[PDB]
């Protein structure tokens, strides 16, 4: 039994030798600059190999540049098998951290069901990644971040842009501030619309909305409360004397940093169309 034992030990040693061999050798065969290739875990090698394989299977620098956010590619199971280089600028994480394993692993729970039903052709939906950037940091000390995603399927492909948090703000556009149920508190307006902050101030913004859209607005509001930020569609909002105007809004939620307590609301409201139909 001891001879079979010593030879088992030695033959198994041979096995592990060719194992580590084929692993770091698979790392050499990657599209990665070796400065990072053989330097990482072999399970990682598995991840990104699988990913890039189903990537090149499923198929100047001008373009990705002007874009805001990054590129996301999923399959029916959710193995997010591609991520564009630019990710680093957002989230804080890097491509290589997350190129080709679960999407639910990096998105906030109590949000996965959206993904689920949206793996069931045009799709505009907000997701809840985890930013680690504030400069880059470590996980669990990192926190939840939102991303507006516009995309289509074929094996899904998505554009994921970030939002402008009014902690870092910046003639077309006007800001606004409201309570939680949306009674105004702080405004700028008349030029493009009609009314005054003096005249409004404390008024439910749902009243000055169009009924045809207030459905979508309430849906994106339930979003707002349940999620973090939002970027709505195109409002047909009323004027003082006039009819409707095409309006866009990127609103935010104010959490009183004192125990992160839901306090106020602020909207960055874009305007598109001129006052249609005066009489």
């Amino acid at each position: 039994s001891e001879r079979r034992k010593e030879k088992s030990r030695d033959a198994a040693r041979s096995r592990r030798s060719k194992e580590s061999e084929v692993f770091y050798e698979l790392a050499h065969q990657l599209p990665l600059p070796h400065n990072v290739s053989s330097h990482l875990d072999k399970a990682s090698v598995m991840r990104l190999t699988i990913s890039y394989l189903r990537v090149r299977k499923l198929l100047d620098c001008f373009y990705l540049k002007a874009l805001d956010g990054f590129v996301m590619v999923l399959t029916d199971d959710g193995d997010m098998v591609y991520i564009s280089d630019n990710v680093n600028k957002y989230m804080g994480l890097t491509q290589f951290e997350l190129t080709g394993h679960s999407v639910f692993d990096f998105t906030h729970p109590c949000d996965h069901e959206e993904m689920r039903e949206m793996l069931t052709t045009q799709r505009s939906f907000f997701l809840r990644m985890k930013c680690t950037l504030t400069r880059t940091m470590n996980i669990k000390s990192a926190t939840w971040k939102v991303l507006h995603c516009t995309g289509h399927i074929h094996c899904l492909v998505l554009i994921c842009e970030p939002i402008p948090h009014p902690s870092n703000i910046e003639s077309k556009t006007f800001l606004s501030r409201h309570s939680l149920d949306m009674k105004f508190s702080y405004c700028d307006i008349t030029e493009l619309m009609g009314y005054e902050p003096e005249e409004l101030l404390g008024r439910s913004i749902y009243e000055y909305y169009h009924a045809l859209d207030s459905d979508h607005l309430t849906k994106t509001h339930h979003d707002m409360f349940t999620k973090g930020q939002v970027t709505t569609g195109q409002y047909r909002m009323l004027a003082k004397r006039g009819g409707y105007v095409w309006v866009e809004t990127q609103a935010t939620v104010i959490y009183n940093t004192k125990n992160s307590q839901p306090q106020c609301i602020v909207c960055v409201n874009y305007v598109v169309s001129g006052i249609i139909q005066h009489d």
Partner: protein
């Protein structure tokens, strides 16, 4: 002590098994189809043998099929545009090519683009659009409503009412709907509005004969009413 030991065994089990699931996924992802399931070493050898068989434009394609938009390098004179502008707004290199972009925006939306040319992001209108850049890219997103009060008094309408019955909003805006009800069932709608206020956020169809599906709306956060939505239509 024992805790760290059995947690060690569990976690290493999970890691091993995830490396085996990675192994299977990879096993079927690669072409060598074989009779049934080779060992993991051979699977890996075939993986790298396959992987020895060896970009921006594919990324371009990706963005196109992700946004339905296009690219343009400008000054307001343009100097280049993406060809994919054609499956978007048509007019390829016609009112583009080397033209000023101003001669392509909505005649009213020129001075905003002027005020935004002292990162850079904005929203514009174009001849049959959200746009971002530093050069940039651009991509794309019988019955009538009636909003009332808690006691029936109107607040809002839809113009195609004038097609439906033939009336104009202002001579209805502010007035009462029970004043418009045939005396017979003036109570009915009343009862209806006696119910929608109690039927928290749920429909209610009544026959005034014009159908209408009245239901209350409570402020999504504070969940208290401020108006009743009543789609009314003819039959």
């Amino acid at each position: 002590e024992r805790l760290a030991r059995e947690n060690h065994s569990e976690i290493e089990r999970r890691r091993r098994n995830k490396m085996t699931a990675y192994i299977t996924e990879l096993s079927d992802m690669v072409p060598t189809a074989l009779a049934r399931k080779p060992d993991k070493l051979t699977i890996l050898r075939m993986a790298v043998s396959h992987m020895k068989s060896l970009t921006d434009q594919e990324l371009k394609h990706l963005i196109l099929e992700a946004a339905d938009g296009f690219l343009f390098i400008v000054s307001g004179r343009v100097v280049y545009v993406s060809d994919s502008v054609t499956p978007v707004l048509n007019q390829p290199q016609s009112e583009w090519f080397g033209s000023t972009l101003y001669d392509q925006v909505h005649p009213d939306d020129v001075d905003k683009l002027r005020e935004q040319l002292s990162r850079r992001s904005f929203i514009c209108r174009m001849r049959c659009v959200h746009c971002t850049g530093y050069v940039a890219i651009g991509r794309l997103q019988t019955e009538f409503i009636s909003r009332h009060n808690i006691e029936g008094i109107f607040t809002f309408v839809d113009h195609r009412c004038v097609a439906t019955v033939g009336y104009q909003p202002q001579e209805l805006l502010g007035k009462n709907i029970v004043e418009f009800c045939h005396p017979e069932d003036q109570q009915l709608l009343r009862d209806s509005f006696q119910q929608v206020v109690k039927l928290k956020g749920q429909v209610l169809s009544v026959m005034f004969w014009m159908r209408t599906s009245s239901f209350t709306f409570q402020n999504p956060y504070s969940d208290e009413i401020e108006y009743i939505i009543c789609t009314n239509t003819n039959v």
